Amino acid sequence: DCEFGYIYRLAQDYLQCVLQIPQPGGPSKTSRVLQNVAFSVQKEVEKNLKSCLDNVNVVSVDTARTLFNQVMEKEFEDGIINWGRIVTIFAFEGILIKKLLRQQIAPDVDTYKEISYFVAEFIMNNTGEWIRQNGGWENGFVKKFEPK
Numbered sequence: 001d002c003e004f005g006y007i008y009r010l011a012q013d014y015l016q017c018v019l020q021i022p023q024p025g026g027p028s029k030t031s032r033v034l035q036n037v038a039f040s041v042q043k044e045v046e047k048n049l050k051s052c053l054d055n056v057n058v059v060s061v062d063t064a065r066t067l068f069n070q071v072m073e074k075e076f077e078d079g080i081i082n083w084g085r086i087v088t089i090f091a092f093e094g095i096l097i098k099k100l101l102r103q104q105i106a107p108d109v110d111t112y113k114e115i116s117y118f119v120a121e122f123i124m125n126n127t128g129e130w131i132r133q134n135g136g137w138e139n140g141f142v143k144k145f146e147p148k
């Protein structure tokens, strides 16, 4: 599950949850657990950062990728990977997609698929082996975050 395709599906499932367009039919047990936890983080970040989230105009996918790179470089600067930081990656892509829905020039219905790709690239290349060694999504993330 630490392969790119699995991570891409998690990132895309979370953007479809934020955008209220879940793929008709349903998400896996991993995505279901992740959407509750990442949404709780997302809402608190949006409340705390309300003032500064207006300091950018996310007019394009390249702007969103630049912002994502800056935020992730800062989030992981101490070299510490943990599950909280992994959930924060998904919460942050949720904030990005909401700003793109409002601000993207020539809004493209497939944009969430491009954001999903670069989120999955970051997760796989920068945290993938930490994730696998800590149980992957099914034996790590879900075991940590699934309901008591």
Ligand SMILES: *CCC(=O)N(c1ccc(O[C@@H]2CC[C@@H](NC(=O)N[C@@H]3CCS(=O)(=O)C3)C2)c(F)c1)[C@@H](CC(N)=O)c1ccc(Cl)cc1
Pocket (backbone or CB within 6 Å): 045, 049, 052, 053, 054, 055, 056, 058, 067, 070, 071, 075, 083, 084, 085, 086, 088, 092, 095, 096, 099
């Ligand atoms: C006011 C802040 C600001 O100007 N920008 C910004 C910076 C960071 C950010 O989100 C980060 C991800 C969520 C949060 N981290 C966090 O809660 N980490 C905790 C400690 C480790 S843990 O995982 O346990 C939890 C901060 C923002 F959403 C916004 C801007 C930064 C920039 N590079 O311009 C900014 C970025 C993006 C947008 Cl859309 C708007 C402003």
